Amino acid sequence: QDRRRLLGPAAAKPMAFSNTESEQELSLHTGFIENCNGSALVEARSLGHQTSLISAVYGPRSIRGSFTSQGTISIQLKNGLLEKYNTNELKEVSSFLMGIFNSVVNLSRYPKSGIDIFVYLTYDKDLTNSQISSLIPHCITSITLALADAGIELVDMAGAGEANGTVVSFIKNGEEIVGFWKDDGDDEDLLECLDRCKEQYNRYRDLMISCLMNQ
Amino acid sequence: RRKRLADGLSVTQKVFVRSRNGGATKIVREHYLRSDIPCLSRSCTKCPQIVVPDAQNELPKFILSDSPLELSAPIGKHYVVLDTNVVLQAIDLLENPNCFFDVIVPQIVLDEVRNKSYPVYTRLRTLCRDSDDHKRFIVFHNEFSEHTFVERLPNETINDRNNRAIRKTCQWYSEHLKPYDINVVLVTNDRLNREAATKEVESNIITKSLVQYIELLPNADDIRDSIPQTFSDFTFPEYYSTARVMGGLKNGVLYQGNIQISEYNFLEGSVSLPRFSKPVLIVGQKNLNRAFNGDQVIVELLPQSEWKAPVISDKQRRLLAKDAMIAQRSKKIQPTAKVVYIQRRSWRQYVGQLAPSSVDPQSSSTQNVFVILMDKCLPKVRIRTRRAAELLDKRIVISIDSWPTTHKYPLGHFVRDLGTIESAQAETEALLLEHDVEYRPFSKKVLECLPAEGHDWKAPTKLDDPEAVSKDPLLTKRKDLRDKLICSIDPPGCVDINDALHAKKLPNGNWEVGVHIADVTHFVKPGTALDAEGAARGTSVYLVDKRIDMLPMLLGTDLCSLKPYVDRFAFSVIWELDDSANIVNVNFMKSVIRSREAFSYEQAQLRIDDKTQNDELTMGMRALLKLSVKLKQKRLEAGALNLASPEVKVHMDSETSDPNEVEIKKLLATNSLVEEFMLLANISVARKIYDAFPQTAMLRRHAAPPSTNFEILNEMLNTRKNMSISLESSKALADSLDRCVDPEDPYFNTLVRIMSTRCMMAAQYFYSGAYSYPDFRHYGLAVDIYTHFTSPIRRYCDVVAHRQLAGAIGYEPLSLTHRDKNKMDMICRNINRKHRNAQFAGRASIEYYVGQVMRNNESTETGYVIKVFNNGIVVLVPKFGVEGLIRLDNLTEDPNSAAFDEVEYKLTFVPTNSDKPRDVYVFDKVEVQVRSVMDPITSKRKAELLLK
Amino acid sequence: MSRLEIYSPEGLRLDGRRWNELRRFESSINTHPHAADGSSYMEQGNNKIITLVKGPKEPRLKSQMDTSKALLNVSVNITKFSKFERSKSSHKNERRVLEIQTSLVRMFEKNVMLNIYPRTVIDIEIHVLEQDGGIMGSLINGITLALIDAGISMFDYISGISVGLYDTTPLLDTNSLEENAMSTVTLGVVGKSEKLSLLLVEDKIPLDRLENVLAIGIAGAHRVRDLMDEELRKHAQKRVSNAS
Amino acid sequence: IDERASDLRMTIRTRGRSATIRETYEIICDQTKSVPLMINAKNIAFASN
């Protein structure tokens, strides 16, 4: 097998078991990792579902490659303890992550400089008796707080709101959209899908700015 | 579609789906047509214009004559093209020597056989190459033929294009055979295929059925009983479908193995399953479901309602199958099974006898007869036939055709017309084949394998002649040992000589031993079909009548036989040993030798103890038996046995026809002279080749018959005879057997020897890579290593041991099939099975030759009781060696006064001819009347034995 | 035990071929003009290969650079749909494959006039589509197209063919059914000569056939670079006759 | 484990011979019940550099 790790004897197996509008909620914390220059802590708990995750910043790191006019972002999603999302399922989100911050970050302030983003999908409850799609907007919030902690030039507190398998990311207090994500749902529910996302965005950004300006 | 190559040559795609393990595996192949396809006949002059050599640079042989059997116009001259079905129905009709001499095999017909049956496919592969001057079979590769190839039409099954292409195949034929007016006859059995040519749809073609062809022969009366083919009290069930049993195999639902149907109970049998310990009985005539004994079947367990004490879902049966193993651990109520499918029929050609009730005397026409088989366990077969008044007092060959639903006894057909009941020649014949003995003469493809001289060859005297070096490149290792003095103890009735020995005396203090075994290995090669017949026949058989042999007659009996002064190739092994029988050195090589005389059994004893023929050849002889005793001692001191069973030789009177004399085999001093050095060659050379090839070497192992094979004698040895056996070591056993002799009967030594024979372990040939080193043991001969070496002709086993020795001396690279343990296990079972098929006839050689003795020459003699039972006692004449149960009522009158004891094993009674209280014990001496009458329900010449 | 018929006594193979016969052999030139200047397509029976060549051009790194000659990269793509049975895992570092990646380099170290292309890169791309056995010599014949497909400097044609041995008998142009049935040898044959580029034997071979066995494949191999040549030439005529 | 698991003994055919796969009793952990862990508690160390 893998000669680099301790994976036990091969013939063992893990243990098996069988059967015998609501509120979302946060707890947002910064400044707790001394390796980084930007850290952010996120608790989430909603109705069957409790979620905690860590966003980590390293920047500006040097680039051994070549010259660029401006900065470059690198984003990692890694499984924590229990929930195991698929590998190719991860990087699609990482693709969707980078597009929004490329309408956020003053890379032109940062020539030949790198951005390292480590996201640790650390622990999630789903006690409910598109499972990754329910965790998208909280990432952007978790990144933004850590990116404020490294103090990097950011245009807006941009945030995403969720309405039932749909993720829409805003700026300008919702007056423009910067990132769009849709799974199955209804048809032409878009206009209501504007709304419930927007107000959570209207909730969340206020929760964020409270976390920093009051500190 | 299709595409073209620039050679005018066509290319298209044949594509299908492999359905293996239920998978849907799409398989695509390209396909080529050629335009050089030969019509392969005598008369055509243009297909011999296109014939091109193979990689062995040969243009083959165009053998179908201008002259067939010509018939009534509009047949005229004709050839025959077949159905698979008429082959599938009448495969043995094809093997008639009397008819069907010129048949094209179509390629698709060839394939459906290869689709249907593997060993039937062997026979057409056999017949086509072994076509002769008389009978000629070709295979026309019609779908390799461009001008006969067809495609799948729209909205078609595969069956339609089969019949159409065969129709297309015949269509080209007469077109090519118009110039010579030899027609082509398409034979079928299919009534819808006998419908489309009724209108003569496209081809003015010869569409006849079997009988519609058979009814046009000049000699069709002899062959129409080889045509294959209410009768109801209830209805028998059927066998499960294909997806049902393949759906049954993986789930653990279904089971296969082998079944044994009893003779004493025709309607009950058990199987030995891999998942199951005990033999699981199958009870009920419907549950046996019209299969025969010995076949490969597929069984299902029965519910506990049908279990025996001495649902829809398979969710139930598996949990019930677990309950079977519980009931297997019970042995108080044990499960029953029934068959649900037949994995394989073990059918073949069969020989029996007819019922006089089944035949009408006054009738001359076709009628039902049943055949009483020679197999006691297998039932009678309804035979709808004409010539039954002929064949009733005659032996017959049948073949089973089918089992439809209604028939309580199957449909089969008579095949071969044998000869008269209890005629010696016919009873010789079926004694071979029902014991599985090959007897047919060596065919046309066989005789193309013998070396080219004939009986006018000699070995080259110059061992370094350049043409002889061009004849033998490996002549470098061939030494010249023609300067030896060779003489062989042989039988009188023997021209198949295996042995060639000298013995010189080295002046160091010791003798010089050289033994020579015939180098046929220079001539039998892997790739020669004659060597395949060495595998196919397996061995040579040895009867009082005759001796059917594995090799051709010129070859083994003359040009390889180590006869006097004839230049012959042998393999030479040179020993030296002291006066204490301790071997100095051994020297493995080839040679050519020159001999003095092959002796009789007696002529050699006319040279051993005579003390007059005192040349140094005989001083070589008197070396041998002097130290053969130490070989006799130290083999038996190593832990071996020495039995004595004179399997008696029927000395047929040399002025008469049928035997009526009973004589015995006499083993004199010459036998222990030769044998102790032959088993020495079976071990010392084996101790060389195990050191050469540890994993592929041919060996033979013998196990211990335990106390379980000996305690039931020991009860007869203790309760009656107040003795026993040792069973600690088989020296101590052979020394506790040496003490079980009674003084008033010195034969009671030998009487146990012939009797403990029946429970000795069956030694068998094997490749040493099958098991480990104390499993190479020969228990009865006390040696941890054991093969056979010294008789090439009757043991093909020994011939192979030359080949793996041929690399051990470096003479030759070893052949590959002599290294594949896959191919070895196929050999080692089978060559034992041929040796199994030998002595079952070798005893039966004595049987019919005893079976004529007591036909009309009765006598009052001594017969020995070997079993005391409640049904009666089995008596055995030691002068004759044939048993007979004198059943209790014909053993004794007043059987209610007859009392059978189990512990003393006594059947004490008052007799039939008297009234004195007769305590019938075991192994005493009686008066007994001998006789024989053949039992008319079995056709075995039973020894009518009656006490007196 | 095989339930089928390897080679007929009547001289025939599975499609009816003789022992000295080929499959249908089709090449093509400039199959992908928009992709690279080396682009050639092979059908040799159902062995179907897309062959692609990039160069002579600048490296990605100055580390991977020489001031004497070119470099040669081999990238083999065996698809999981290349066979009947679909292979589970990918092959992209499989040690079986890397051997061939070594192999074609040393086979083609010595046709390329390496000195007259220094400081530049040759990359050879392989796409194994449909696989029919005879797989090794299938490749090399596709290579010999692709270098000429851009017209790179070289010495000669180079031919490749697997030839199998059923017991005594050579088999030109075996298939994968026959490949699993017997012993086979592939020959990398150079031009018209009797000199070898590739020689590879996996199966067990008795020694004594081998000289004869080697003597077989040359006539096949000469007919290979035969059929490559005119097929290029009739393409080569099609240019200037309609260019001019 | 199961009372009597359906996953039982299966056979595999050799080139003439056969063997038996042993019955596959898949252990299952309870959704509910649990016991603690037994520790040589008098050897539970701690660390310091």
Swiss-Prot record, chain A:
Non-catalytic component of the RNA exosome complex which has 3'->5' exoribonuclease activity and participates in a multitude of cellular RNA processing and degradation events. In the nucleus, the RNA exosome complex is involved in proper maturation of stable RNA species such as rRNA, snRNA and snoRNA, in the elimination of RNA processing by-products and non-coding 'pervasive' transcripts, such as antisense RNA species and cryptic unstable transcripts (CUTs), and of mRNAs with processing defects, thereby limiting or excluding their export to the cytoplasm. It comes from Saccharomyces cerevisiae (strain ATCC 204508 / S288c). Keywords: Cytoplasm, Exosome, Nucleus, RNA-binding, rRNA processing. SUPFAM superfamilies: Ribosomal protein S5 domain 2-like. This is Exosome complex component MTR3. It is found in: Cytoplasm; Nucleus, Nucleolus. The keyword Transmembrane does not apply. Belongs to the RNase PH family.
Swiss-Prot record, chain B:
Residues 1-227 are annotated as: Endoribonuclease. The keyword Magnesium does not apply. PROSITE patterns: RIBONUCLEASE_II, S1. The keyword Transmembrane helix does not apply. Its main location: cytoplasm. Its EC number is 3.1.13.-, 3.1.26.-. Transmembrane segments: none annotated. Residues 478-808 form the RNB domain. Residues 233-346 form the CSD1 domain. Catalytic component of the RNA exosome complex which has 3'->5' exoribonuclease activity and participates in a multitude of cellular RNA processing and degradation events. In the nucleus, the RNA exosome complex is involved in proper maturation of stable RNA species such as rRNA, snRNA and snoRNA, in the elimination of RNA processing by-products and non-coding 'pervasive' transcripts, such as antisense RNA species and cryptic unstable transcripts (CUTs), and of mRNAs with processing defects, thereby limiting or excluding their export to the cytoplasm. Belongs to the RNR ribonuclease family. This is Exosome complex exonuclease DIS3. The gene is DIS3.
UniProtKB/Swiss-Prot annotation, chain C:
It is found in: Cytoplasm; Nucleus, Nucleolus. InterPro entries: ExoRNase_PH_dom1, ExoRNase_PH_dom2, ExoRNase_PH_dom2_sf, PNPase/RNase_PH_dom_sf, Ribosomal_Su5_D2-typ_SF, RNase_PH. Keywords: Cytoplasm, Exosome, Nucleus, RNA-binding, rRNA processing. One of its GO terms (biological process) is nuclear polyadenylation-dependent CUT catabolic process. The keyword RNA-binding applies. The keyword ATP-binding does not apply. It comes from the Eukaryota. Its main location: cytoplasm. GO terms for cellular component: cytoplasmic exosome (RNase complex); exosome (RNase complex); nuclear exosome (RNase complex); nucleolus; nucleus. GO terms for molecular function: RNA binding. Present with 5150 molecules/cell in log phase SD medium. Belongs to the RNase PH family. Non-catalytic component of the RNA exosome complex which has 3'->5' exoribonuclease activity and participates in a multitude of cellular RNA processing and degradation events. In the nucleus, the RNA exosome complex is involved in proper maturation of stable RNA species such as rRNA, snRNA and snoRNA, in the elimination of RNA processing by-products and non-coding 'pervasive' transcripts, such as antisense RNA species and cryptic unstable transcripts (CUTs), and of mRNAs with processing defects, thereby limiting or excluding their export to the cytoplasm. This is Exosome complex component SKI6.
Swiss-Prot record, chain D:
It comes from the Eukaryota. It is found in: Cytoplasm; Nucleus, Nucleolus. Non-catalytic component of the RNA exosome complex which has 3'->5' exoribonuclease activity and participates in a multitude of cellular RNA processing and degradation events. In the nucleus, the RNA exosome complex is involved in proper maturation of stable RNA species such as rRNA, snRNA and snoRNA, in the elimination of RNA processing by-products and non-coding 'pervasive' transcripts, such as antisense RNA species and cryptic unstable transcripts (CUTs), and of mRNAs with processing defects, thereby limiting or excluding their export to the cytoplasm. Present with 3180 molecules/cell in log phase SD medium. Component of the RNA exosome complex. Specifically part of the catalytically inactive RNA exosome core complex (Exo-9) which may associate with the catalytic subunits RRP6 and DIS3 in cytoplasmic- and nuclear-specific RNA exosome complex forms. Exo-9 is formed by a hexameric base ring of RNase PH domain-containing subunits and a cap ring consisting of CSL4, RRP4 and RRP40. Interacts with NIP7 and NOP8. Interacts strongly with RRP46. Belongs to the RNase PH family. This is Exosome complex component RRP43. It comes from Saccharomyces cerevisiae (strain ATCC 204508 / S288c) (Baker's yeast).
